[PDB]
Design an enzyme around this catalytic site. Structure first.
Site, PDB file in Angstrom:
ATOM      1  N   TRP A  79       0.798  -1.221   0.000  1.00 33.81           N
ATOM      2  CA  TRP A  79       0.000   0.000   0.000  1.00 33.81           C
ATOM      3  C   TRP A  79       0.835   1.278   0.000  1.00 33.81           C
ATOM      4  O   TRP A  79       0.287   2.364  -0.205  1.00 33.81           O
ATOM      5  CB  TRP A  79      -0.919  -0.001   1.219  1.00 33.81           C
ATOM      6  CG  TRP A  79      -1.785  -1.211   1.327  1.00 33.81           C
ATOM      7  CD1 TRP A  79      -1.714  -2.191   2.278  1.00 33.81           C
ATOM      8  CD2 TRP A  79      -2.869  -1.571   0.457  1.00 33.81           C
ATOM      9  NE1 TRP A  79      -2.698  -3.142   2.060  1.00 33.81           N
ATOM     10  CE2 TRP A  79      -3.419  -2.784   0.949  1.00 33.81           C
ATOM     11  CE3 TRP A  79      -3.438  -0.984  -0.675  1.00 33.81           C
ATOM     12  CZ2 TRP A  79      -4.505  -3.419   0.337  1.00 33.81           C
ATOM     13  CZ3 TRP A  79      -4.530  -1.607  -1.271  1.00 33.81           C
ATOM     14  CH2 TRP A  79      -5.048  -2.817  -0.764  1.00 33.81           C
ATOM     15  N   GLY A 113      -7.232   5.292   1.492  1.00 35.31           N
ATOM     16  CA  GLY A 113      -6.084   5.487   2.339  1.00 35.31           C
ATOM     17  C   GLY A 113      -6.307   6.595   3.352  1.00 35.31           C
ATOM     18  O   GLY A 113      -5.379   7.356   3.662  1.00 35.31           O
ATOM     19  N   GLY A 114      -7.533   6.705   3.875  1.00 35.85           N
ATOM     20  CA  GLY A 114      -7.799   7.650   4.952  1.00 35.85           C
ATOM     21  C   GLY A 114      -7.801   9.120   4.567  1.00 35.85           C
ATOM     22  O   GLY A 114      -7.882   9.968   5.459  1.00 35.85           O
ATOM     23  N   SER A 195     -12.652   2.556   0.285  1.00 36.59           N
ATOM     24  CA  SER A 195     -12.271   3.219   1.547  1.00 36.59           C
ATOM     25  C   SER A 195     -12.454   4.724   1.378  1.00 36.59           C
ATOM     26  O   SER A 195     -13.567   5.155   1.029  1.00 36.59           O
ATOM     27  CB  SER A 195     -10.859   2.768   1.953  1.00 36.59           C
ATOM     28  OG  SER A 195     -10.673   2.806   3.371  1.00 36.59           O
ATOM     29  N   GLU A 322     -13.958  -6.132   7.834  1.00 39.59           N
ATOM     30  CA  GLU A 322     -13.464  -4.769   7.639  1.00 39.59           C
ATOM     31  C   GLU A 322     -12.528  -4.299   8.764  1.00 39.59           C
ATOM     32  O   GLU A 322     -11.529  -3.613   8.505  1.00 39.59           O
ATOM     33  CB  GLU A 322     -14.646  -3.818   7.517  1.00 39.59           C
ATOM     34  CG  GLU A 322     -15.529  -4.054   6.301  1.00 39.59           C
ATOM     35  CD  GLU A 322     -14.838  -3.631   5.000  1.00 39.59           C
ATOM     36  OE1 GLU A 322     -13.611  -3.327   5.011  1.00 39.59           O
ATOM     37  OE2 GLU A 322     -15.521  -3.617   3.955  1.00 39.59           O
ATOM     38  N   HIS A 435     -10.003  -5.595   5.168  1.00 36.69           N
ATOM     39  CA  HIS A 435     -10.242  -4.348   4.450  1.00 36.69           C
ATOM     40  C   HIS A 435      -9.235  -4.184   3.316  1.00 36.69           C
ATOM     41  O   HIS A 435      -8.028  -4.285   3.539  1.00 36.69           O
ATOM     42  CB  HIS A 435     -10.127  -3.193   5.436  1.00 36.69           C
ATOM     43  CG  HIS A 435     -10.424  -1.850   4.847  1.00 36.69           C
ATOM     44  ND1 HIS A 435     -11.701  -1.459   4.519  1.00 36.69           N
ATOM     45  CD2 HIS A 435      -9.633  -0.766   4.635  1.00 36.69           C
ATOM     46  CE1 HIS A 435     -11.683  -0.205   4.092  1.00 36.69           C
ATOM     47  NE2 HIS A 435     -10.441   0.239   4.154  1.00 36.69           N
TER      48      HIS A 435
HETATM   49  C1  LIG Z   1      -5.006   1.381   1.870  1.00 37.96           C
HETATM   50  C2  LIG Z   1      -6.378   0.737   2.081  1.00 37.96           C
HETATM   51  C3  LIG Z   1      -7.480   1.813   2.366  1.00 37.96           C
HETATM   52  C4  LIG Z   1      -6.800  -0.090   0.860  1.00 37.96           C
HETATM   53  O1  LIG Z   1      -6.377  -0.209   3.214  1.00 37.96           O
HETATM   54  C5  LIG Z   1      -5.844   0.079   4.464  1.00 37.96           C
HETATM   55  O2  LIG Z   1      -5.605   1.260   4.736  1.00 37.96           O
HETATM   56  N1  LIG Z   1      -5.545  -0.939   5.493  1.00 37.96           N
HETATM   57  C6  LIG Z   1      -5.184  -2.351   5.064  1.00 37.96           C
HETATM   58  C7  LIG Z   1      -3.861  -2.912   5.715  1.00 37.96           C
HETATM   59  C8  LIG Z   1      -2.720  -1.906   5.752  1.00 37.96           C
HETATM   60  C9  LIG Z   1      -3.120  -0.586   6.417  1.00 37.96           C
HETATM   61  C10 LIG Z   1      -2.672   0.546   5.443  1.00 37.96           C
HETATM   62  N2  LIG Z   1      -3.121   1.945   5.942  1.00 37.96           N
HETATM   63  C11 LIG Z   1      -1.965   2.973   5.943  1.00 37.96           C
HETATM   64  C12 LIG Z   1      -2.434   4.379   6.503  1.00 37.96           C
HETATM   65  O3  LIG Z   1      -3.708   4.724   5.905  1.00 37.96           O
HETATM   66  C13 LIG Z   1      -4.742   5.275   6.696  1.00 37.96           C
HETATM   67  C14 LIG Z   1      -4.469   6.369   7.548  1.00 37.96           C
HETATM   68  C15 LIG Z   1      -5.509   6.950   8.342  1.00 37.96           C
HETATM   69  C16 LIG Z   1      -6.837   6.455   8.292  1.00 37.96           C
HETATM   70  C17 LIG Z   1      -7.120   5.344   7.422  1.00 37.96           C
HETATM   71  C18 LIG Z   1      -6.094   4.766   6.634  1.00 37.96           C
HETATM   72  C19 LIG Z   1      -6.737   3.668   5.874  1.00 37.96           C
HETATM   73  C20 LIG Z   1      -8.122   3.654   6.253  1.00 37.96           C
HETATM   74  N3  LIG Z   1      -8.376   4.677   7.217  1.00 37.96           N
HETATM   75  S1  LIG Z   1     -10.017   4.939   7.904  1.00 37.96           S
HETATM   76  O4  LIG Z   1     -10.968   4.288   7.043  1.00 37.96           O
HETATM   77  O5  LIG Z   1     -10.255   6.346   7.806  1.00 37.96           O
HETATM   78  C21 LIG Z   1     -10.075   4.326   9.701  1.00 37.96           C
HETATM   79  C22 LIG Z   1      -9.503   5.048  10.786  1.00 37.96           C
HETATM   80  C23 LIG Z   1      -9.543   4.599  12.143  1.00 37.96           C
HETATM   81  C24 LIG Z   1     -10.175   3.370  12.454  1.00 37.96           C
HETATM   82  C25 LIG Z   1     -10.769   2.626  11.409  1.00 37.96           C
HETATM   83  C26 LIG Z   1     -10.713   3.106  10.063  1.00 37.96           C
HETATM   84  C27 LIG Z   1      -4.687  -0.483   6.685  1.00 37.96           C
END
Ligand SMILES: CC(C)(C)OC(=O)N1CCC[C@@H](CNCCOc2cccc3c2ccn3S(=O)(=O)c2ccccc2)C1
Ligand SMILES: *[C@@H]1O[C@H](CO[C@@H]2O[C@@H](C)[C@@H](O)[C@@H](O)[C@@H]2O)[C@@H](O[C@@H]2O[C@H](CO)[C@@H](O)[C@H](O)[C@H]2NC(C)=O)[C@H](O)[C@H]1NC(C)=O
Ligand SMILES: *[C@@H]1O[C@H](CO[C@@H]2O[C@@H](C)[C@@H](O)[C@@H](O)[C@@H]2O)[C@@H](O[C@@H]2O[C@H](CO)[C@@H](O)[C@H](O)[C@H]2NC(C)=O)[C@H](O)[C@H]1NC(C)=O
Ligand SMILES: *[C@@H]1O[C@H](CO[C@@H]2O[C@@H](C)[C@@H](O)[C@@H](O)[C@@H]2O)[C@@H](O)[C@H](O)[C@H]1NC(C)=O
Ligand SMILES: *[C@@H]1O[C@H](CO)[C@@H](O)[C@H](O)[C@H]1NC(C)=O
Ligand SMILES: *[C@@H]1O[C@H](CO)[C@@H](O)[C@H](O)[C@H]1NC(C)=O
Ligand SMILES: *[C@@H]1O[C@H](CO)[C@@H](O)[C@H](O)[C@H]1NC(C)=O
Ligand code: NA
Length: 526
Positions: A79, A113-114, A195, A322, A435
């Site tokens: 990622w 990616g948040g 996401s 998720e 997720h």
């Molecule tokens: C990249 C995608 C979206 C496909 O897959 C993932 O990211 N993952 C899979 C496993 C590796 C990890 C990677 N991530 C790195 C940093 O990226 C973020 C920073 C900040 C809030 C983020 C994200 C991501 C969702 N959020 S969030 O939905 O807002 C959220 C926030 C708090 C609690 C629950 C959800 C994670």
């Protein structure tokens, strides 16, 4: 090999895919680089070039902090950006079938990616399989993230908010002016993302300025009504000012603050983004969408509730587990390297992590609704409960509620529940159907036999790819030829959904009914 666009000529490159050919245009600029005095501003239209722009490799990814918790681990590192970070990052990609199509439907991918991370160049977003197999055109764009894409002083055009969303919007705009030259039908454009990308897609359904720029929408594990997705006006300013204090840019003139933040190096802004919140997690959406009065005219919960959105078909869905991915980024007792059997005390400690500003009673109410065990001696009880808590609260119930409300205004909506765990999944088995791990099935990576997916996975991706494309093309996500289960519309009365797995594709009803009554009707009160 060469396509003339409104702004100049671009040269592509031929790719061999499944004994066929796909033409990739990697790295086409769609805006003036948001550099110098353009930092924090809405994206500006691009002046023509006279040469042939060479679109033969992915461009720079936008500046962003990198996930560092699992160095060398493919499960996290797949990622991370795989091109240079730069502020000069407003580029897009086009995969067109070869031979050049006549009037092909266009799929536009918006990564998640948040809103703090992500890039269109990731391997799992490679649109060459969709172009080859379904003769659709796949477009994807980079858009600004973090403070550089979403810092907000509302009303102030030096930093109005939602820049990265306007980046996305300018790219959809580019597809309208230009995609016909590539063989695409601008009248048949389907947005899809996952996401924060799916949250983005739903905000385009809400934004008047995007209504004429696409036809249909696909939301994978995300919607604007998810609790992480929209930052309040109060929060957004406190975060802007906190970033300012952290960089010595506090001023009385708000415009002077912005000018001060313009002379800081990209890396000083990035280092201080994490600390603009006190409830500071690697999963804080530190700078994200806001009600700016331009992209978003009102609070999106109101627009959704009162039918103020684009009327069209949606395809919405979520994965079975998720929430599990986020437990190894802070919850006590969790590890990707063991089975993370946690106790009651560790579960309660986890709620404080993921629900930082919530009252004691709010946290006990979560514990109460999720700890009435079918068997209290099963040791994985608390481990799996915390996963379901994070996933139901953050993804599954916001997506179900979005689908209900959107369909109540008369549009066809299709809901899926993805429950296949990739055979190549590098995270441990306790994290389940994680997720983000439907994305590779959607983009058809299991269609490459050399990539050591199973035969059943190739067939699942092939059916999913067909349904996505039939939805994009015809508004109806059926697979009509291989005696497949017919996918019914999601109605707010019966709430039918389709399960996606390698064995049997089933029709069920009222996904997570008990859990989502708690999250949507009771918990917003606490
Ligand atoms: C990249 C995608 C979206 C496909 O897959 C993932 O990211 N993952 C899979 C496993 C590796 C990890 C990677 N991530 C790195 C940093 O990226 C973020 C920073 C900040 C809030 C983020 C994200 C991501 C969702 N959020 S969030 O939905 O807002 C959220 C926030 C708090 C609690 C629950 C959800 C994670
Ligand atoms: C709004 O912001 C203030 C200030 O944030 C602090 O300073 C920033 C530069 C950054 O480093 C943050 O992490 C800091 O917290 C918040 O006030 C702080 O609150 C915490 C506990 O909530 C307290 O321990 C600190 O001493 C406070 N600091 C100051 C200067 O007041 C505040 O909580 C934020 N939120 C709201 C709703 O006001
Ligand atoms: C699962 O692992 C966690 C994480 O601990 C780290 O990762 C391990 C895989 C190993 O490399 C350890 O050396 C590391 O410390 C464990 O959580 C820790 O548990 C101990 C004892 O309970 C405690 O002292 C630490 O504070 C915990 N660390 C945390 C919560 O971050 C956990 O106990 C392991 N569980 C099982 C069932 O193996
Ligand atoms: C753009 O590309 C032109 C053609 O390059 C051809 O394709 C690339 C991928 C290389 O393999 C090269 O050896 C081929 O000849 C170049 O002639 C031209 O200089 C390039 N333009 C710019 C501005 O870089
Ligand atoms: C593409 O399809 C649209 C309708 O969807 C039509 O109006 C347009 O003229 C077509 N262009 C072609 C076939 O070149
Ligand atoms: C400083 O504030 C003044 C008015 O308070 C206004 O011109 C602007 O916001 C700032 N000045 C400049 C030159 O940016
Ligand atoms: C339908 O089945 C055939 C084999 O009978 C297979 O080759 C083809 O890929 C399947 N198509 C879809 C869309 O699943
Ligand atoms: Na209840």
């Amino acid at each position: 090999i060469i396509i003339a666009t409104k702004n100049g000529k671009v040269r592509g490159m031929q790719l061999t895919v499944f004994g066929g050919t796909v033409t990739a245009f990697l790295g086409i600029p769609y805006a003036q680089p948001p550099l110098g005095r353009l930092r924090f501003k809405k994206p500006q239209s691009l002046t023509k070039w006279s040469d042939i722009w060479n679109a033969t490799k992915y461009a720079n990814s936008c500046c962003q902090n990198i996930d560092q918790s699992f160095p060398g681990f493919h499960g996290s590192e797949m990622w991370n950006p795989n091109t240079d970070l730069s502020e000069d990052c407003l580029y897009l990609n086009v995969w067109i079938p070869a031979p050049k199509p006549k009037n092909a439907t266009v799929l536009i991918w918006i990564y998640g990616g948040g809103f703090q991370t992500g890039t269109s160049s990731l391997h799992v977003y490679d649109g060459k399989f969709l172009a080859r197999v379904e003769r659709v055109i796949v477009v994807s764009m980079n858009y600004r993230v973090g403070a550089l894409g979403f810092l907000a002083l509302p009303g102030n055009p030096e930093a109005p908010g939602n820049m990265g969303l306007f980046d996305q919007q300018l790219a959809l705009q580019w597809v309208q002016k230009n995609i016909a030259a590539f063989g695409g039908n601008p009248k048949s454009v389907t947005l899809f993302g996952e996401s924060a990308g799916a949250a983005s897609v739903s905000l385009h359904l809400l934004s008047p300025g995007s209504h004429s720029l696409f036809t249909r929408a696909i939301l994978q594990s995300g919607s604007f009504n998810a609790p992480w997705a929209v930052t309040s006006l109060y929060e957004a300013r406190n975060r802007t000012l906190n970033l300012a204090k952290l960089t010595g840019c506090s001023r009385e003139n708000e415009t002077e603050i912005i000018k001060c933040l313009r002379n800081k190096d990209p890396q000083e802004i990035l280092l201080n983004e994490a600390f603009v919140v006190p409830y500071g997690t690697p999963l804080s959406v530190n700078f994200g969408p806001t009600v700016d009065g331009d992209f978003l005219t009102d609070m999106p919960d109101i627009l959704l509730e009162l039918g103020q959105f684009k009327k069209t078909q949606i395809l919405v869905g979520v994965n079975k587990d998720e929430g599990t991915a986020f437990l190894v980024y802070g919850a006590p007792g969790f590890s990707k390297d063991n089975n993370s059997i946690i106790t009651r005390k560790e579960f309660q400690e986890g709620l404080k992590i993921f629900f930082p500003g919530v009252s004691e009673f709010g946290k006990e109410s979560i514990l109460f609704h999720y700890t009435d065990w079918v068997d209290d001696q099963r040791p994985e009880n608390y481990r799996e409960a915390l996963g379901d808590v994070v996933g139901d609260y953050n993804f599954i119930c916001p997506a179900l509620e979005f689908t209900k409300k959107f369909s109540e205004w008369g549009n066809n909506a299709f809901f899926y529940y993805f429950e296949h765990r990739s055979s190549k999944l590098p995270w441990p088995e306790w994290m389940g159907v994680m997720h983000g791990y439907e994305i590779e099935f959607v983009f058809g990576l299991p269609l490459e036999r050399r990539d050591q997916y199973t035969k059943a996975e190739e067939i699942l991706s092939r059916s999913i790819v067909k349904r996505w494309a039939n939805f994009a093309k015809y508004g109806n996500p059926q697979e009509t030829q291989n005696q497949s289960t017919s996918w019914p519309v999601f109605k707010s009365t019966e709430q039918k959904y389709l399960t996606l797995n390698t064995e049997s594709t089933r029709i069920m009803t009222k996904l997570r009914a008990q859990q989502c009554r708690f999250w949507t009707s009771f918990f917003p009160k606490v």
